[PDB]
Amino acid sequence: LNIAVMLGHSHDVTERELRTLWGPEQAAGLPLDVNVVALLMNRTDPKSLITHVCDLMSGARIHGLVFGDDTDQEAVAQMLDFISSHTFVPILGIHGGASMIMADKDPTSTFFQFGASIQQQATVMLKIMQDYDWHVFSLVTTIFPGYREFISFVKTTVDNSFVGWDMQNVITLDTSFEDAKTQVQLKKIHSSVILLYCSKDEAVLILSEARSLGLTGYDFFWIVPSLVSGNTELIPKEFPSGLISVSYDDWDYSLEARVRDGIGILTTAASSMLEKFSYIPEAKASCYGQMERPEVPMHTLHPFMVNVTWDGKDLSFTEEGYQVHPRLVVIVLNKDREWEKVGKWENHTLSLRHAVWPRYKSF
Amino acid sequence: GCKLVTIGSGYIFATQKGSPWKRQIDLALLQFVGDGEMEELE
Amino acid sequence: TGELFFRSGFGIGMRKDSPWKQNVSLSILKSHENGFMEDLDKTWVRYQEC
Amino acid sequence: SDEPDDNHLSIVTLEEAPFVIVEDIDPLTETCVRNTVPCRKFVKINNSTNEGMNVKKCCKGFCIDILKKLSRTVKFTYDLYLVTNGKHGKKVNNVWNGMIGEVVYQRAVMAVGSLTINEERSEVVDFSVPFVETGISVMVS
Amino acid sequence: HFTPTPVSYTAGFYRIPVLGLTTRMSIYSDKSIHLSFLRTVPPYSHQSSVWFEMMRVYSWNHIILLVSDDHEGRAAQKRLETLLEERESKAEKVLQFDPGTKNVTALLMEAKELEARVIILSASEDDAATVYRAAAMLNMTGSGYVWLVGEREISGNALRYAPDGILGLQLINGKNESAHISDAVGVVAQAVHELLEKENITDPPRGCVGNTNIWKTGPLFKRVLMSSKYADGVTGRVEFNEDGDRKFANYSIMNLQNRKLVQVGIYNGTHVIPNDRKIIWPGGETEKPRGYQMSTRLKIVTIHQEPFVYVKPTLSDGTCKEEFTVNGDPVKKVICTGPNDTSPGSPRHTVPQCCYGFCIDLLIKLARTMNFTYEVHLVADGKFGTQERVNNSNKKEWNGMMGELLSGQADMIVAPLTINNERAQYIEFSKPFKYQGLTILVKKEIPR
């Protein structure tokens, strides 16, 4: 009935109104009168959240939520908890800080995001190590909150493999600005493929150190996921050829294509509502009162977001809200340090690449 | 010459505490018997 | 034909927190030393030929 | 300027052919033979002066190849000497000699030998896996 | 349910450090999502470490763990399993719950099956109170049934249905929050005067409008707060863990006696001070009990291998016959419960079947020399069982006899098992019988 949209300043608003009109005239012609309110911003700001969110909750109790920003702050998707729990309105995170999945989805969270699904990150990273037979590792993470998770993923999913991956240990840099202890721990790298799980500025630091360590040689290889790439629009200087990331970027997609896809996901969830109910639990009224309780007596979309299919693409979601058939655009930096299309994972989560083994090519 | 015959054709009659080395030594011996390097010494 | 391939011993399935590895293995030492191994060699092993 | 290290394993065994075969120091422009470890015997001076001079002598055999394998797998340091008082173990009012005397009184903290894992010896000393099959045989012409 | 999430995370947009004063909800202790939130009062999972001190005073090896499945509960499980496997101490069971379990009685009958009577509790109040009913209901409370209790269950009706003599915990200076005010203002004031000694002190943003950038000195706030020491606190030394929870905050261990808590245990953080008020263990006397009580009843499953186990049928009585050896000696025979159709996907009918062989002679020798009874079964698989993958193509699990011991179904394998290194990594052999190896059946060729 109502979908709210807050974006980064990008492709414009009347463009999104035309996208909504084209999605409405496309297919699944909606006995629910779906009406969408969209805006373009640039803020990571909670008063903007209070103004926009509470004024749209005052206005006709808007039921759908789409968020593709031009941002990078990971905790914004974690701060969507109070929208998911103080409105109980389902949330869609496509780009920006809403894309950055570090919020392990709570039973009070109503999160469904097009962002970089973590378990699928680990499995796709291992299948990247499969498909060019790079069995010899070196593992460097840091102790950002949530990387011990990835340490557990690497340990279990190698130990659950009969492949027998050649393991060099997870070299966790403790704090930033050590600059002598980091070089001691990074002279411990004695293999070819170096797997990084860090931030962006720490990646600047580690590449500046490893260009002195001789580890950025171009028989070494560097497969660093969307924690460091993020915006492909931002190409900083010290990031050479052969940097390999896994991200749900609009190279293979556009903004409005994913807009129409996610609105279709919401309308199949609403059609499953109209199957299993004939009424809808409305959104809340105000941010400033708690009238009776938070009793969800009409049972919002978490069983209804289970089964979603569109146009030959299963846009259904798992129990923790991650994509059952994911997109997973695998993007490799080249000589010109350009984020280019290499791999896909849309067909039974199988790789779709260029068979180009050599990528570190004298940047 | 080996006219000196022992007991039968191989018929054999009569058929530190608290060290943490014991697991290491015994799993190592499982590896060597599983690899047959004792047979190489043989 | 052939030698004994993978020369191991025939042991007993015992959990790690089982406290009775001790006196059972002492009885195993008694079975080797007092020929109870040889007693099962008599009573079940060594009967038949062709 | 300590840096404590506890890796040195006093392994004092018998001369047991071909498990332990002890050669002397070869004058081959050094003291380095391809399969040997120096082992400090206690070479006693006289019968009245029983001062056992720790004479390094070359050492080979099964068990020394096994200790080389354990320096390649368990990867520690192993201290080789030879047994003079008793051979394996003697209940001299249960005052053990030989291998068991060096184990119980912790002279040889580790002891390998061609040691028969006896039930009486398992009462006193723990043992590893059997690594060579044995038992009692009879040699005749 | 108004434990303070929202002020903390609305401060957690731009990575601003917040000190929870008296919070014990270890959800907030999770650094992965709760970014910059540290506490003057440590939660209950730190208390998990305290129970290990009970171990070193009261010499336990068999452990009953009861966890309502919570992020708090699973994080406490992680701390427990780490501190177990660092000292190689091994728990028996971790039974799992939700907050709201009332049909605990099946899991209670599972809990009746152990040597251990050491009961470690982590759930809500009414969970505890109904369990103090159902287990007492089982009978299951007698001297040895020691209730190791988190402090949430030392509130409400969990108080009002528990028996007496129960070891509970109290954090010293948990409620007098004026001492927490004095300590926290001293800590934060000298932390600010550590901040002002640093460089590049970024300006705090006024607006929550237009300020599109996280704090830079956020991690410098963290480096101030983690590295600052405050020995002169009212509660003791205000010095933190690597969780931002205080080290060596004073502990006490209490005992409901006529439902009146009685001081026994005192800790600085680690130093054992038992009070002169004695521990009447929560059933019978002040004697330190034993979670060690054998049954001499050994669950054996036997592999269908002749001559080791000749598997023949019984009589029409369900009983074995009266036969003899070649020596005219009546065979030691075992009635063995096992399937008829010993194939997967078949109607398997547990029938008494006669068993014959080496290991029966061995077990009756051990019955005479060792005084045990033996509970003998046949294998439904007819197989040893290896690590193979279950679906989702990663689940490496021991099958067969290995799967039967590692599930608690079988307690003994009395069978000619070859010594395997990987099996010894899970299930450790005794001294072996026969030093043998694989041989090869080759056909006898016919004469010319």
Chains that touch D (3 or more CB pairs under 8 A): B, C, E
Give the 3-state secondary structure of chain E.
CCCCCHHHHHHCCCCCCEEECCCCCCCCCCCCCCCCEEECCCCHHHHHHHHHHHHHHHCCCCCEEEEECCHHHHHHHHHHHHHHHHHCCCCCEEEEECCCCCCCHHHHHHHCCCCCCEEEEECCHHHHHHHHHHHHHHCCCCCCCEEEECHHHHCCCHHHHCCCCEEEEEECCCCCHHHHHHHHHHHHHHHHHHHCCCCCCCCCCCCCCCCCCCCCCHHHHHHHHHHCCEEEECCEEEEECCCCCEECCCEEEEEECCCCEEEEEEECCCCCEECCCCCCCCCCCCCCCCCCCCCCEEEEEECCCCCCCEEEECCCCCCCCCCCCCCCCCCCEEEEEECCCCCCCCCCCCEEEEEECHHHHHHHHHHHHHCCEEEEEECCCCCCCCEEEECCCCEEEECHHHHHHCCCCCCEEEEEEECCHHHHCCCCCCCCCCEEEECCCCCCCCCC
Q: What's the DSSP call for residue A104?
A: P
C-alpha distances in Å from residue A130, one per residue of A137, A192, A217, A341, E127: 12, 15, 22, 19, 48
Strand order in the sheet with C5-13: E413-418, C5-13, E435-438
Report the alpha-carbon distance of residue A356 to residue A342 in Å, rounded: 9
Burial E128-151 (b: 16+ CB within 10 A, else e): bbbbbebbeeeebbebbbbbbbbb
Distance of CA E221 to the CA centre of its chain: 37
Q: What's the DSSP call for residue A144?
A: S
Q: Name the residue of chain E whose CA is nearest to D134's CA.
A: E435
Q: Do chains C and D touch (3 or more CB pairs under 8 A)?
A: yes
Q: Do C15 and E411 touch (CB under 8 A)?
A: yes
E361–C contact, CB cutoff 8 A: yes
For the record, the structure tokens of D60 come out as 């080979």
Q: Do E9 and A102 touch (CB under 8 A)?
A: no
- Degrees, nearest 5: CA angle E72-E78-E82: 150
Report resolution (Å) to 1 decimal: 5.1
Report the alpha-carbon distance of residue C41 to residue C19 in Å, rounded: 29
A 10 A CB-CB count for C19 gives 11
On whether A249 is known to bind a ligand per the annotation, the reply is: yes
Report the alpha-carbon distance of residue A239 to residue A207 in Å, rounded: 7
For A308, the enclosing helix (H) or strand (E) is none
Report the alpha-carbon distance of residue A307 to residue A310 in Å, rounded: 10
Report the alpha-carbon distance of residue E170 to residue E250 in Å, rounded: 9
E231–D contact, CB cutoff 8 A: no
Closest Cβ opposite residue E212 in set A43, A159, A175:
A43
A 10 A CB-CB count for D84 gives 15
Count Cβ atoms within 10 A of the Cβ of residue E394 and give its class: 0-12 exposed, 13-18 middle, 19 or more buried.
middle
Q: Please report the beta strands in D1-141, taking only residues with DSSP state E, as ranges in sequence order.
A: 8-13, 21-22, 39-43, 53-57, 59-60, 77-82
Give Dmax over CA atoms of chain C in angstroms: 46
Report the alpha-carbon distance of residue E408 to residue E393 in Å, rounded: 25
Report the alpha-carbon distance of residue D74 to residue D68 in Å, rounded: 10
Q: Is the distance from CB of C44 to CB of E331 less than 8 angstroms?
A: no
Q: Name the residue of chain B whose CA is nearest to E434's CA.
A: B15
For the record, the structure tokens of A268 come out as 């199949």
Count of alpha carbons within 13 Å of A9, Cβ hemisphere only? 4
Q: Do E429 and C11 touch (CB under 8 A)?
A: yes
The position carrying tokens 């068993």 is: E355
Q: Is the distance from CB of E258 to CB of E165 less than 8 angstroms?
A: no
* DSSP state letters, A78-100: HTTHHHHHHT---EEEEEGGGT-
On whether D114 is known to bind a ligand per the annotation, the reply is: yes
On whether D72 is known to bind a ligand per the annotation, the reply is: no
The nearest CA of chain D is from the CA of C25 a distance in Å of 9
The position carrying tokens 């799967």 is: E403
* Positive or negative: CA dihedral A123, A129, A135, A140: negative
Q: Do C11 and E327 touch (CB under 8 A)?
A: no
A 10 A CB-CB count for E307 gives 11
C-alpha distances in Å from residue D21, one per residue of A138, D28, D69, D97, D135: 45, 19, 17, 21, 22
The nearest CA of chain B is from the CA of D74 a distance in Å of 7
Backbone angles phi, psi at A338, to 5 degrees: -115, 135
Q: Is the distance from CB of A141 to CB of A171 less than 8 angstroms?
A: yes
Report the alpha-carbon distance of residue A119 to residue A321 in Å, rounded: 12
Backbone angles phi, psi at A258, to 5 degrees: -70, -30
Report the alpha-carbon distance of residue A120 to residue A97 in Å, rounded: 19
Report the alpha-carbon distance of residue E347 to residue E341 in Å, rounded: 6
Q: CA-CA-CA-CA torsion for D94, D95, D97, D99, nearest 10 degrees? A: 70
Method: cryo-EM
* Positive or negative: CA dihedral E104, E107, E108, E111: negative
Report, in angstroms and rounded to the nearest whole number, the Rg of chain D calculated over CA atoms. Answer: 17
User: How many Cβ pairs within 8 Å bridge chains B and D?
Assistant: 68
Contacts with A20 (C-beta within 8 Å, 6 or more apart), sequence order:
A36, A38, A259, A263
Count Cβ atoms within 10 A of the Cβ of residue B37 and give its class: 0-12 exposed, 13-18 middle, 19 or more buried.
middle
For A209, the enclosing helix (H) or strand (E) is helix A200-213
Backbone angles phi, psi at E15, to 5 degrees: 60, 60
Report the alpha-carbon distance of residue E241 to residue E248 in Å, rounded: 9
The nearest CA of chain D is from the CA of C5 a distance in Å of 14
Distance of CA E203 to the CA centre of its chain: 48
The nearest CA of chain A is from the CA of E31 a distance in Å of 6
